[PDB]
Design a binder for this molecule. Structure first.
Ligand SMILES: CC(=O)N[C@@H]1[C@@H](O)[C@H](O[C@@H]2O[C@H](CO[C@]3(C(=O)O)C[C@H](O)[C@@H](NC(C)=O)[C@H]([C@H](O)[C@H](O)CO)O3)[C@H](O)[C@H](O)[C@H]2O)[C@@H](CO)O[C@H]1O
Ligand SMILES: CC(=O)N[C@@H]1[C@@H](O)[C@H](O[C@@H]2O[C@H](CO[C@]3(C(=O)O)C[C@H](O)[C@@H](NC(C)=O)[C@H]([C@H](O)[C@H](O)CO)O3)[C@H](O)[C@H](O)[C@H]2O)[C@@H](CO)O[C@H]1O
Ligand SMILES: *[C@@H]1O[C@H](CO)[C@@H](O[C@@H]2O[C@H](CO)[C@@H](O)[C@H](O)[C@H]2NC(C)=O)[C@H](O)[C@H]1NC(C)=O
Ligand SMILES: CC(=O)N[C@H]1[C@H]([C@H](O)[C@H](O)CO)O[C@@](O)(C(=O)O)C[C@@H]1O
Ligand SMILES: *[C@@H]1O[C@H](CO)[C@@H](O)[C@H](O)[C@H]1NC(C)=O
Ligand SMILES: *[C@@H]1O[C@H](CO)[C@@H](O)[C@H](O)[C@H]1NC(C)=O
Ligand SMILES: *[C@@H]1O[C@H](CO)[C@@H](O)[C@H](O)[C@H]1NC(C)=O
Ligand SMILES: *[C@@H]1O[C@H](CO)[C@@H](O)[C@H](O)[C@H]1NC(C)=O
Lengths: 171, 318, 319, 171, 318, 171
């Protein structure tokens, strides 16, 4: 577990129908929201991958060894029953394990793509910002809606605001 | 001023199972166990034969019900629950092995034995148990030999079929077991009856036995069928005293096909590769819980009603 | 002034295998493979029948060892290692199919055939090979028919059993293979012997074979046994003139039960759902290494003595 | 693997017993050691989930196809042995796999929960402390026992000590 | 003034599959599915017997082709295609079970039955069909009993083999099915032929099935074989009248060996534990796609050319 | 997924052929490059551990149940065919799962060792350096080829440069 999605982030955003992960900002000119496309597509692509593998199976032709409409000699029938049931136990077990292990990875993968976004934005902000425990960055300079976009756009230039930001952090 | 990171959620999550959690709630999920099938045998793209009430054994010996299925080609052979093999009551030795051989075949050709019998033999025995065109008949591919002069000893007779073909032939015969002494005598005489059959890969002796037994389709006597495979170039000989139910044609199973036993009506306008008693399964899911008995290329049967694959993150609502 | 983070540890940790390490030390671990079974047959909760020295086959024909096992109801049938089927030498055709059918049943009832025989037939033949009260007897469910007058031709006889019930019935008969021409002639006459057996679904016929054979219980004769299921509303007819060991009752196999082959002693104080030759197995674990051959609801057998499942974190003790 | 257990944490505390994860601190009044209940439960609960899935028993009833006390026809005896052996190889390999795969996950989930606690404290302490590298936080102010509990309780307000601690970090 | 962290990468990576990604490039991978076998039977460290053109069934009855293979010890037994079991026309009842027993054994001894016959029996019957060193001969382990004086009734004969050893013995006998009643009367007389075979746990009767008419049809002379195990301390009796092909030796299967059907040349410098029709498989990989039919200690067969296991990180070239 | 390989590391280095992970530095005297032995061995060891399980061969001896050279009875033959194809679908499925899962984990494991090398260096440098988000640390004092070595070597004493570095970060 990568400590974010059901961790230091309080909860999800039912309001974000735009994607899997995103940003909510507050500045002088109010509040706003945008989903981050790269990350959500990183997770989604991985899901569709698991799904492709799930339905890949190209299959062996089997014929009947059990008459539907006539009786089968008892001993051979009992061997067939024991086999078919053994095979079915194996598949039931593999299906259960496939799903459970896959579901573990899927959840944790999604937790990961979220931590990765977070960390990108953290490094991007450098010394111009600090974290609260809950997944936000308290930015120590006035950030323009144009500036907010540059954080999501991944084009934000930290040196530009550093002087201003640093004074505010220490005073 | 502040910026915040987050993930989406939905009001109504889906429970899925993990390695650590029975009850884990995620955003979306999808089924991996197929539970619905098609109520038709989807035979599009297949050269298929629906046998109706004709049992595969009945094809080789020519029971009236199989008159439409004495020869053909198929890649798929459909056997039905009401299937009739025997009009005249009796049984076949190693019947299920033979049924399975027919049901994996890709067709059947019929080849005349060419057997001729002298004037002492009546080869046209018929019975009310095998009706055909409103009249008494008999297995189409077999001949019921009896004494032409009633009560006279059926003559010592030798018949030989030669496989001059390049593939093996399946040949069938019957052995009449009369239901009384009077009837045995009328049909074959008072002499001791003996039928022996032999080829390079087969030898056996049969003796008709008289026995009281229940009436089936009105009849207390029986006909037991036997069969063997006659290899190319080889010959098989019947040596008989009376009681032989002689082949007038033999069979040739050709190629391969998929045998299906089903209840379901044919749909020649849909395609499938997976079949069962109830019809067809067309799915991309790797598991199914419809039936432990399928044929063709199927998902695998699992003892589970549902197995959900998460397709989204943990769902944490507001 | 500082605050530090850390995890616990233990002096004696246990090794498990991982994907990358066959020798990985961890705090707790726990077994997944059951290695200890109960050397008793746990039968608490089960209405069971312990056949003792009675073989399942002998229940149907009524060999003396099975006299307390000729009828009954059970969900668990226990068969023992040298159980007796045949007091008189011989064997059953298709025996294992039949034994399996009985070991799958949940009980057996018996139904008289009502067979009767004319005056010139002695139907109370007995042998020193099958004893009751230390005296000559025979299979309880069968009759050894011989000519009442020695050396005489055994009459042509017809016997028909009719299944008037709504379930199928298991009928068994014997064919006597004499030890010499002399004996054969004495019992059944000099005529040729022919037994035919016919129902709607079954037809077969049998010829007693005379021949010198090793003595089993001082007897070179054999009685071999034969069987078939008779469907509701159907009849099976025996036509015969010497050599038939005729059924006096037939059997009805009822419902379902689990068949166990084992010499382990019964124990009514513990329950189980999994059994093998050496006893029972009771365990929550999914795997076991006791035996590859089990019956009931069992952990899967595996070729491993031990598989430890890490139930704690990595063990990193102090230097 | 996550960085901590058998990682930047040199070793574990045999001395700790009321939990899997815990705090040790040193201030003016002396030393102290307190297990963290929240993180210890996060791990244990996930373990019990594995154990639960382990004993979840699917109940296919099997009968005998191999007589113990009589002769088995030879050809069918060989099929049965071959089938049973092929099934046992499958279950044995599946048992080996299950345990190896599960053990790998357990150990790393354990590591994870440690890193999460460490991360939770770090974000908590904000700019009043600096990381040891060995899993500790040098707090650049005076923190009495109640201040320590406040760190463990997740009730520590950093803004209260910030100006004092910041001055110590800078000089 | 700066320190940078990073990882290696390669000019040419390898595509592997993951849970979330087919076509995932990594720095290195290694194959898990062995597709390469060696076309030889590696017998180093194995005490083996290559039977050449001798069929395992031939060992028990002494067909000329198996003269060098009537006894032996081995941990490995190798059967070749088209090996000869019979010199005279006929076949073995229940043959495939017997052949598996022999191919499950670690050797064979022979024990004389000690059978002797009265003066009116000729026990040295031979045939042109079983040539040995240029002369009419017969299966080494059997004797063809006929009437010393042609046309006369073969006497009622009894022969008993007693196992006095502590292990079960495998006894084989033959039954002659004559080509015609005329040949049958010459060899054995006009009486009715009967052959009974009885032990404590086995009884059977056989009646020669007399052929008919031309020698070149399907009912001509054959000798068919039968077998059974004789437990220690038990006796088996043959009561017969003409038509028994009696054993002069019985066999004793010993220990376990591994049976191989292959036409791969034997290589003795080479050691292996896994074999198939086309040779051996020596590999450490847990899977192979060589063949679904292997014996010995084998990697599991799978229907995949290649399954690559990553042995390095994601390859991320500049 | 950790954030590094194919993450905030833009790409791998083809010229680094003496280890899986390493260091490229820049100071006044020039450019340098070195591999980190401990991290690359941590990875190679785990790979070899996986390979070891692969070739684990305690194996069951099987005997023929179908004759290469003669005909089998039709019905037991069909049973054997159905059983053998069933067993093979299972092994084929297990083989695919094994390497799909194994590969996933290998990719991610390698990624974590990268991150842990990164995290180690970060905590070493303490307040004397800052992250550029592409895997590099910008160091706020002259760093000697010898000083770089102390970083790769894990003997960098941050306090030795703290004063200088802290004022260079601000001015
Ligand atoms: C028919 C008769 O009594 N003949 C005398 C033989 O019994 C006797 O040989 C001895 O036979 C013994 C077996 O005798 C029984 C038996 O218990 O098995 C006696 C039964 O009453 C008889 N039952 C019936 C229905 O026939 C039974 C049966 O005939 C046989 O089992 C058929 O084999 O035989 C025992 O085997 C002794 O070892 C044997 O010597 C001979 C010699 O005394 O004289 C006969 O008159
Ligand atoms: C009994 C006899 O010699 N009768 C003469 C026939 O042999 C002969 O027909 C020819 O028979 C040939 C086979 O002869 C052998 C054999 O198989 O080699 C000769 C063996 O001595 C003899 N051995 C025994 C134990 O009897 C053997 C055996 O009887 C048979 O195999 C049983 O079928 O036969 C061969 O088949 C020739 O093709 C055939 O013409 C006829 C015609 O010459 O006259 C008989 O007097
Ligand atoms: C096989 O036959 C032999 C003789 O035909 C039987 O052995 C005799 O057995 C009795 C009692 O066991 C001894 O008194 C004799 O001394 C034995 N004869 C010899 C010369 O050893 C043997 O019992 C028979 N086996 C079976 C199973 O019937
Ligand atoms: C070949 C022959 O005999 N055909 C006759 C048969 C047989 O005699 C019995 O089926 C044998 O018992 O009996 C019939 O009554 C019948 O079956 O309709 C009339 C038919 O002409
Ligand atoms: C639910 O899953 C299916 C298949 O994975 C997909 O078609 C659909 O878009 C998903 N729905 C949502 C809510 O995303
Ligand atoms: C069964 O026996 C009864 C009594 O004779 C008879 O009515 C009936 O016809 C028989 N059934 C059959 C199938 O012959
Ligand atoms: C089959 O019969 C033909 C014609 O008589 C003959 O040429 C051939 O040899 C016979 N086949 C065999 C194998 O006897
Ligand atoms: C671990 O479990 C075992 C058995 O379940 C038990 O004996 C032991 O007391 C437990 N110890 C711990 C909690 O480490």
């Amino acid at each position: 577990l990568f400590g974010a999605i059901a961790g230091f982030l309080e909860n999800g955003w039912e309001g974000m129908v735009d994607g899997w992960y995103g940003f909510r900002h507050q500045n002088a000119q109010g509040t706003g929201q945008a989903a981050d496309y790269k990350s959500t597509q990183a997770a989604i692509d991985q899901i569709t991958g698991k799904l492709n593998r799930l339905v890949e199976k190209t299959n062996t032709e089997f014929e009947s060894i059990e008459s539907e409409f006539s009786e089968i000699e008892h001993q051979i029938g009992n061997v067939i029953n024991w086999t078919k049931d053994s095979i079915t136990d194996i598949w039931t077990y593999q299906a259960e394990l496939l799903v459970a292990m896959e579901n573990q990875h899927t959840i944790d993968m999604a937790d990961s793509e979220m931590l990765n976004l977070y960390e990108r934005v953290r490094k991007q902000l450098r010394q111009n910002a600090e974290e609260d425990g809950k997944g936000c960055f308290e930015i120590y300079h006035a950030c323009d809606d144009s500036c907010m976009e540059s954080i999501r756009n991944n084009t934000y230039d930290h040196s530009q605001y550093r002087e201003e930001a640093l004074l505010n952090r220490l005073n | 001023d502040k910026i915040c990171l987050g993930h989406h959620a939905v009001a109504n999550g889906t429970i899925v199972k993990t390695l650590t959690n029975e009850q884990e709630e995620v955003t979306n999920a999808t089924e991996t166990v197929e539970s619905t099938g098609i109520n038709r045998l989807c035979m599009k793209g297949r050269k298929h034969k629906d046998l109706g009430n004709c049992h595969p054994i009945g094809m080789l010996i020519g029971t009236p019900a199989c008159d439409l299925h004495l020869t053909g080609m198929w890649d798929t052979l459909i056997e039905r629950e009401n299937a009739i093999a025997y009009c005249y009551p009796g049984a076949t030795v190693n019947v299920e092995a033979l049924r399975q051989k027919i049901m994996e075949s890709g067709g059947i050709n019929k080849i005349s034995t060419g057997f001729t019998y002298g004037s002492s033999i009546n080869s046209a025995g018929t019975t009310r148990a095998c009706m055909r065109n409103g009249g008494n008949s008999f297995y189409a591919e077999l001949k019921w030999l009896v004494s032409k002069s009633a009560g006279q000893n059926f003559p010592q007779t030798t018949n030989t079929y030669r496989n001059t073909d390049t593939a093996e032939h399946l040949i069938m015969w019957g052995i009449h077991h009369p239901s009384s002494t009077q009837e045995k005598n009328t049909l074959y005489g008072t002499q001791s009856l003996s039928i022996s059959v032999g080829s390079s890969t087969y030898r056996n002796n049969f003796v008709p036995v008289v026995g009281a037994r229940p009436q089936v389709n009105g009849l207390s006597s029986r006909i037991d069928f036997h069969w063997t495979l006659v290899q190319p170039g080889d010959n098989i000989t019947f040596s008989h005293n009376g009681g032989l139910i002689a082949p007038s044609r033999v069979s040739k199973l050709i190629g391969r096909g998929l045998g299906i036993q089903s209840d379901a009506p044919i749909d020649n306008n849909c395609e499938s590769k997976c079949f069962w008693r109830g019809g067809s399964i067309n799915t991309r899911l790797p598991f199914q819980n419809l039936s432990p008995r399928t044929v063709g290329q199927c998902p695998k049967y699992v003892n589970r009603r549902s197995l959900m694959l998460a397709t989204g993150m943990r769902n944490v609502p507001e």
